[PDB]
DNA sequence: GAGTTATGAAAACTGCACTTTTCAAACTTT
DNA sequence: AAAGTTTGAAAAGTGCAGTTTTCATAACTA
DNA sequence: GAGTTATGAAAACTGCACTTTTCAAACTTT
DNA sequence: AAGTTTGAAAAGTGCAGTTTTCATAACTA
């Protein structure tokens, strides 16, 4: 059903309601295919209807996320931000909803996101465009017309060298690691370096998903739409800590032919995977803007555009879905524009 | 018998009620042709004339998958599911509860779908939502007052979100290997050896294998002729060379008279009935394993798959990939007709 | 948006009412690709926008086919026959719509359909299964219930063959043609012949759809979605009759680079192509079940598998959506299924 | 400002408000770069609030599209069609679907379409889906009565290989046609040289119109030349020189008798520059000439071919997108693609 | 020990609604 | 005719709203 | 003359709903 | 060891529905 745009007296509870409503669409829209919980996640769309306050409505989405609901973390917090500028205690324009403006938002965003980055404060831009879009489609009186706001608010990645790269590899065999997770975490890490894969990639890996033909390995990836990317490695790369690792494996209570599994038996998370690549970036001395596993991955794809100059090659091996995506990792020099206009003077 | 949309007082009972007569339905129009006791399968359309509970609609759909009415699974548990949420969602979906049939809307079967799918397959998704489009689609077809007027859900849910697994020729020479120089007991080995062979060479399906007949093989000029049954009283036929099959036969039907076998079934259990896929698929995925061969499919259809495959690298004929495999559509066919080595090479110089 | 199944005392005029209604949403969900004057379309759909009677809706729709708009012919005459139907048995014996069923139906098509193809006899039902479709999902009274009808009433084609193929090319040429149209209709039947592109194809077809290169012509199709599909013949077939035609060409007042066309300078007819092949067919002596140009494609079809054996050459070359489609130009042989079996060795 | 729904008695008259209101929100909205005399469009939006006929909208979207405004052309035209489609099914009908604003839903605009897009392609349907849609929203944005409250259409409609070129030999006999064909003396060294840039180049139609001389840069046998954009950025393509040197020195020495507006390389008998229409007739008649006549015949289908070329030359898509201006490599990535004489040999 | 849960912040993607452009017949001028 | 321009028509091209994921640290458990 | 207009009939396609099956972990029996 | 049950994940297809051409009559030029 539809709502009148104010329907309690309190402009900043209507306010609040509005959010509510919101957050509450989107649990619904937003992918769903790394819940873990499908029960906490119905619980969710219940206690968001039946929030009364800004830290209620806070909590619930941070157990959505929490439960795997991932995306709803974009849009929970700048809208709670917006909804404590507005219900500011004030002496002597924020009497009701219709007074939300351009020139309001626009003042809330230079107020709120004052020392974050250029992303970030896109991301507070989206999510402000986002829950007025739905108000003005949502809200109706019985005379069937609505109010309308109308809101519009109108190169290389940090990366290892190849040289880098070499001592990095170097340096994972070289640091210290204790036995029972020697051989799975190095395993791990220079699957990433050498495939350029993911971080949920890597960790969701199954032994099924890997074949051996010629001295070298298949890998099919899982994406979205349920389909998959493949890539390869050669074998002799991993072949002695695949063989290694598996062994030690059998020892787990391993789920779902799971490869990397901790002594629980479930996948590893995000967070030990982190500190494991930093701190071999840390013993290699290559600290700088970015320490991760994402890193490795844009060190990957720019080591494959300079050894191959194949934009397309980039693109199937990187997944992308677009081109526009692998030019990133590209840098043109304009005197080339002369193997251009030699086309026609040779072969 | 069309019946009214709303019977009793509670809107949960009579979701119940309009289920048991979907699944009614569903059960005597979905194929009954893979049903070995038809008594089986008559009790539980007895019990489905009358109103059950959730408990009762979920023991007597599986009764009547384990007969052999397959079809009924694909949408037995998803409208089951759709009752447990039913039952405590509208109580709680906003302040006021949802006391009728005609608080179900298309906004409310969304809300069930996102949170019944989550962290589930693309294609499980759509058998879902499959399942509730017939259940609205039903009860708009079946329901009507005494004025012969009716209540329309007009339910649409229009939101609706390369070359398969397979061996080739020197991945099916090793697998073949596997199949004789693997460990099987003495009372199993000449049958399931028989059953897989005859599969991997002729690229049958699992059902059609395991349903095959002894008056069903010929054999003239050092080949078989094997007749498979199909829909109603259709035959459809393969080839074999006798050479592949012929010492495995002799032994295995020599052996077979030791089985309490009532008919001539020519693959069967101890008990003499039937082999069931998931024997099978386990046999299978056994020897793909001690060959080193385990990839993203395991069972049987990967070996159709592989048949079909090699079929057309060898002759490159369309119409005979339809014709030995049994597609009733080309469109089928045409799936096996379908540079990351250069981007693994950069670590070396 | 939305009207009671009931709005009228009698029931057969209230049957005109909602058949009105089924044509005017045909008129406007069908495809005007094909209509060379719209504003004979306007005058349509402001006609279907009131109650009509049978013979006015019958004109009407006349009237939209005959403007280009041909999709509506499958529809109209079906069910103004069956209005005819369930007038004259209602006086016999029917008091309401309710009544209509699918034993009624069924009756009304073995009256009707009497005598008439079974493809014939399936257009009928298709219209027919439409009209109450439609009805279920536009009648409603003023307590939003609705009635509900729920209907659902549950080799190789005709062609020449290489030898006759060979003779009625001959006869093309053979034939006595006026020498006001020889040129023009010698270089469009022999196109068809050799490419086997559809009759309205044909007759659409433009100069800059051909590319002269190496000694062989592309010729670009254009289809569905306003895609091109292309099939190529061999130079000698057809440039010398190419070159003769479009310098007589220049005589006519055509415009847009249209290829053939008549005196006042416009596209030929499907009427006049037919009746042009069917009197070479009649002169070669290959008179059969099918004399036009479609079955001209039908041939094409067919030698292509026989002398190629490739089904997806078929397929792209033809114009076919679906594989299945080319599979009816196919004749398998049982015992080949041994040299799948032979594959292994 | 915003303005209520139904100001006016007829609610024809009321559609050419809201359409002349749409308008010219769209002439301030779309891009202005091809605009030279920037006074005559302030001259079009002032005209624009007081069209008040079909004529004289008609007349002022004309004159917007002449000063560089193009885009227009896309939304005038089916508006324009559709405001005339209202106003005589509501004088001849007297349907009371055309008594309100209001009454005007997706039914009528479904019919409208059947009518008006009756023999067009496939295509133009989707430009005129486009302007309807965009018209009604912003309406649904633009419309308030006194209390602040709108009305709300909400309108929905339901939806509905290398590209044409020459290939190296084609081009061969593409560029000395060029020279063989017959042209006056008095264009001859113009049009050569025009056309002979663009297809050593690829550059587009307006691209080519616009070249200054003073953009030239000449430096070891090799042109730098740089293209105008959008805002203040230039693009560049390099072209070697003895490819057009004699045609250039040639040309230059005849455009000293014109009356040259705005520094161009190229212009007509009257001083300001040519238009897309001649270069392309131009274009044609070379291309007929050498019996190369095909799906497309202008510039653009050179720009196809220098592409095509330079990506069968050299295999890199980066230098595709850098030579020819592309900003998305989605559309650089169309001249990677690419049996039918098998079928063609089945009557021998 | 060998890892997890929680979290504000910062990206890392994805695709289609919409903008921007030329095609090419009809027309006008010198 | 040569030398152009106007115009309906038909595309050719892409910016940015919107979705999905990781960064990188604190607080746990011992 | 060389074609068009009109028409009931007879196809010639096109595409996606939804029916039917196996995958494969968990579970049971001889 | 020798099986079957089961939620889950596909594998596969018949038919509603759209868009032509067939083939003749009746014309005029
Ligand atoms: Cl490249």
Same mark, same amino acid.
């Not at 924020?94 to 309001?104: A, G, P």
């Not at 965003?109 to 507070?124: D, E, I, Q, R």
């Not at 074998?235 to 787990?252: D, G, Q, T």
């Not at 090659?313 to 193997?339: M, P, W």
């Given at each position: 059903?539809?709502?009148?745009?104010?329907?309690?007296?309190?402009?900043?509870?209507?306010?609040?309601?509005?959010?509510?409503?919101?957050?509450?669409?989107?649990?619904?829209?937003?992918?769903?295919?790394?819940?873990?919980?499908?029960?906490?996640?119905?619980?969710?769309?219940?206690?968001?209807?039946?929030?009364?306050?800004?830290?209620?409505?806070?909590?619930?989405?941070?157990?959505?996320?929490?439960?795997?609901?991932?995306?709803?973390?974009?849009?929970?917090?700048?809208?709670?931000?917006?909804?404590?500028?507005?219900?500011?205690?004030?002496?002597?324009?924020?009497? &009701?909803? $219709?007074?939300?403006?351009?020139?309001? =938002?626009?003042?809330?965003?230079? *107020?709120? /996101? @004052?020392?974050? #980055?250029?992303?970030?404060?896109?991301?507070?831009?989206?999510?402000?465009?986002?829950?007025?879009?739905?108000?003005?489609?949502?809200?109706?009186?019985?005379?069937?017309?609505?109010?309308?706001?109308?809101?519009?608010?109108?190169?290389?990645?940090?990366?290892?060298?190849?040289?880098?790269?070499?001592?990095?590899?170097?340096?994972?065999?070289?640091?210290?690691? &204790?036995? $029972?997770?020697?051989?799975?975490?190095? =395993?791990?890490?220079?699957?990433? *370096?050498? /495939? @350029?894969?993911? #971080?949920?990639?890597?960790?969701?890996?199954?032994?099924?998903?890997?074949?051996?033909?010629?001295?070298?390995?298949?890998?099919?990836?899982?994406?979205?739409?349920?389909?998959?990317?493949?890539?390869?490695?050669?074998?002799?790369?991993?072949?002695?800590?695949?063989?290694?690792?598996?062994?030690?494996?059998?020892?787990?209570?391993?789920?779902?032919?799971?490869?990397?599994?901790?002594?629980?038996?479930?996948?590893?998370?995000?967070?030990?995977?982190?500190?494991?690549?930093?701190?071999?970036?840390?013993?290699?001395?290559?600290?700088?803007?970015?320490?991760?596993?994402?890193?490795?991955?844009?060190?990957?794809?720019?080591?494959?555009?300079?050894?191959?100059?194949?934009?397309?090659?980039?693109?199937?091996?990187?997944?992308?879905?677009?081109?526009?995506?692998?030019?990133?990792?590209?840098?043109?020099?304009?005197?080339?524009?002369?193997?251009?206009?030699?086309?026609?003077?040779?072969?």
């Amino acid at each position: 059903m539809k709502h009148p745009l104010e329907e309690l007296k309190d402009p900043t509870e209507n306010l609040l309601l509005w959010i509510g409503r919101f957050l509450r669409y989107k649990c619904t829209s937003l992918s769903n295919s790394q819940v873990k919980d499908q029960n906490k996640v119905f619980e969710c769309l219940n206690e968001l209807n039946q929030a009364c306050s800004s830290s209620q409505l806070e909590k619930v989405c941070k157990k959505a996320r929490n439960a795997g609901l991932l995306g709803i973390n974009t849009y929970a917090l700048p809208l709670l931000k917006f909804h404590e500028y507005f219900s500011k205690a004030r002496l002597i324009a924020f009497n &009701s909803l $219709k007074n939300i403006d351009e020139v309001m =938002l626009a003042e809330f965003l230079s *107020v709120y /996101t @004052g020392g974050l #980055s250029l992303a970030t404060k896109k991301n507070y831009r989206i999510a402000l465009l986002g829950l007025f879009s739905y108000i003005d489609k949502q809200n109706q009186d019985e005379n069937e017309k609505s109010y309308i706001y109308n809101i519009t608010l109108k190169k290389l990645p940090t990366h290892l060298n190849n040289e880098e790269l070499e001592k990095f590899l170097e340096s994972i065999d070289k640091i210290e690691m &204790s036995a $029972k997770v020697r051989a799975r975490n190095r =395993l791990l890490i220079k699957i990433i *370096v050498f /495939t @350029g894969m993911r #971080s949920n990639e890597a960790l969701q890996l199954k032994i099924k998903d890997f074949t051996l033909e010629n001295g070298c390995y298949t890998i099919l990836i899982k994406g979205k739409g349920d389909k998959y990317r493949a890539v390869m490695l050669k074998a002799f790369h991993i072949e002695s800590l695949l063989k290694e690792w598996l062994i030690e494996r059998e020892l787990y209570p391993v789920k779902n032919d799971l490869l990397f599994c901790n002594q629980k038996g479930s996948a590893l998370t995000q967070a030990y995977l982190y500190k494991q690549v930093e701190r071999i970036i840390n013993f290699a001395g290559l600290r700088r803007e970015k320490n991760g596993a994402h890193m490795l991955r844009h060190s990957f794809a720019t080591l494959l555009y300079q050894k191959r100059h194949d934009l397309i090659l980039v693109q199937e091996a990187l997944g992308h879905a677009s081109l526009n995506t692998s030019r990133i990792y590209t840098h043109f020099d304009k005197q080339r524009l002369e193997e251009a206009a030699s086309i026609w003077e040779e072969n």
